[PDB]
């Protein structure tokens with residue numbers, strides 16, 4: 377993980 | 384807005 | 391926002407044969423009155439999820455299959471239902487690449503594998519091993535050239551070396567991928583990344599080298615070798631460099647093991663043109679004629695359609711593509727792939743820039759890749 381979103 | 388990130 | 395009833399919007403990467411695809415779409419429109427617009431946005435695979443449902447997304451998205459499981463988990467892709475007779479038209483393993491949670495979620499188009507591309511005039515006999523590349527560079531440097539340039543910014547290009555001596559993404563166990571068991575920090579992965587960092591430390595490659603830099607360098611005859619996929623052959627053809635396509639070099643005696651993509655066409659689950667998309671893909675695109683049109687624009691690789699692949703197999707460049715593909719692995723399509731690629735991207739950049747040691751970089755990658763994550767990000 378480590379990134380964000382939201383998809 | 385309403386989206387996310389983080390860039 | 392461009393989706394409309396009775397029209398099709400298609401996204402495909404800008405290095406692929408989008409003009410050839412537009413031509414199949416032109417034929418589709420003559421036959422059905424359904425206009426087909428092909429677009430090639432930057433980072434289309436990252437853009438897709440957030441614009442698919444209500445935004446300016448496409449009716450059809452073309453990308454390697456590894457991204458598709460994640461899309462499907464979020465309900466973004468229409469299940470496809472080709473009949474057994476149509477399925478029998480394509481190699482069985484290509485259907486497996488686009489099967490996720492028991493369902494087909496895209497049409498397989500072509501198998502993309504990385505190969506070693508070399509300048510026959512600068513280097514009539516390419517190296518069999520990664521280990522001999524430093525010496526070859528020193529030689530070529532003396533003549534104002536370099537041995538090898540390829541895209542270091544995308545982990546797709548460096549993974550084959552990292553995997554060669556034992557690096558792996560997720561452990562396959564009890565018939566499924568174990569998302570908590572990541573193999574990017576084992577002995578083989580460390581050896582692979584260490585060799586890469588050393589190439590950079592000893593000035594045989596540049597840590598900021600990217601796709602466009604490596605392509606120009608090779609196509610302008612300044613570097614003897616590059617690593618790239620079939621789509622790249624068209625531009626080399628234009629350059630008139632006398633090139634060969636061959637098996638990737640071994641590392642510690644083991645084949646480079648590229649992660650292999652199956653270029654696939656997914657249908658937007660929120661498109662009001664799903665039936666239209668199915669018809670285009672099954673009856674127009676996945677035909678000898680449709681694929682030839684895209685292939686003659688930019689080569690596809692080893693196509694999924696048996697009848698056409700049998701014609702392409704005569705090409706030694708395709709034979710090389712297949713050989714590298716067989717020594718690698720079709721990518722998993724599980725949602726956790728994007729976390730994996732992100733972890734490796736980060737580790738490679740940090741290690742190559744000297745901002746972390748290999749051991750530190752890969753340890754962090756293993757930790758991050760394994761972090762639990764739900765279907766909406768993380």
Ligand SMILES: *[C@@H]1O[C@H](CO[C@@H]2O[C@@H](C)[C@H](O)[C@@H](O)[C@H]2O)[C@@H](O)[C@H](O)[C@H]1O[C@H]1O[C@H](CO)[C@@H](O)[C@H](O)[C@@H]1O[C@H]1O[C@H](CO)[C@@H](O)[C@@H]1O
Pocket residue numbers: 382387388766
């Ligand atoms: C960012 O959102 C996450 C996730 O939000 C929850 O789950 C998502 C799927 C759902 O859509 C949403 O409605 C929630 O149920 C939250 O857990 C984070 O806290 C949130 O971080 C922002 O807000 C917190 C404070 O609550 C800040 O400390 C963070 O720095 C974030 O704030 C910035 O990010 C936002 C978007 O740019 C801005 O509002 C703010 O600049």
Ligand SMILES: *[C@@H]1O[C@H](CO[C@@H]2O[C@@H](C)[C@H](O)[C@@H](O)[C@H]2O)[C@@H](O)[C@H](O)[C@H]1O[C@H]1O[C@H](CO)[C@@H](O)[C@H](O)[C@@H]1O[C@H]1O[C@H](CO)[C@@H](O)[C@@H]1O
Pocket residue numbers: 381382389762763764765766767768
């Ligand atoms: C980030 O969002 C997730 C929510 O994600 C959604 O729900 C989870 C269960 C699911 O697995 C995922 O796919 C989505 O559906 C929240 O659960 C996290 O708490 C949130 O983490 C950030 O925000 C929280 C506070 O709300 C922080 O405690 C975390 O450290 C994260 O912080 C991020 O925002 C901070 C900016 O203030 C930064 O430190 C960091 O970028």
Ligand SMILES: OC[C@H]1O[C@H](O[C@H]2[C@H](O)[C@@H](O)[C@@H](O)O[C@@H]2CO)[C@H](O)[C@@H](O)[C@@H]1O
Pocket residue numbers: 403453454455456457502544545546547651731
């Ligand atoms: O580098 C990580 C990246 O690799 C793969 O992307 C390839 C793609 O499969 C090829 O078709 C071509 O477009 O080059 C891309 C890499 O630059 C994965 O498919 C992708 O998900 C991943 O992020």
Ligand SMILES: *[C@H]1O[C@H](CO)[C@@H](O)[C@H](O)[C@@H]1O
Pocket residue numbers: 390
């Ligand atoms: C912030 O900027 C990035 C880069 O343009 C976008 O991709 C993102 O959607 C947001 O607009």
Ligand SMILES: *[C@H]1O[C@H](CO)[C@@H](O)[C@H](O)[C@@H]1O
Pocket residue numbers: 379383435436437439457460728729767
């Ligand atoms: C969720 O999945 C999307 C599509 O693959 C990524 O672009 C995003 O960064 C995250 O991994």
Ligand SMILES: *[C@H]1C[C@@H](N)[C@@H](O)[C@H](C)O1
Pocket residue numbers: 381382383385386387440766
């Ligand atoms: C996060 C907020 C916005 N991007 C939504 O579309 C997703 C589902 O959750």
Ligand SMILES: *[C@H]1C[C@@H](N)[C@@H](O)[C@H](C)O1
Pocket residue numbers: 378379380388389390
């Ligand atoms: C959010 C987490 C990750 N995307 C970081 O790169 C940014 C700056 O913040």
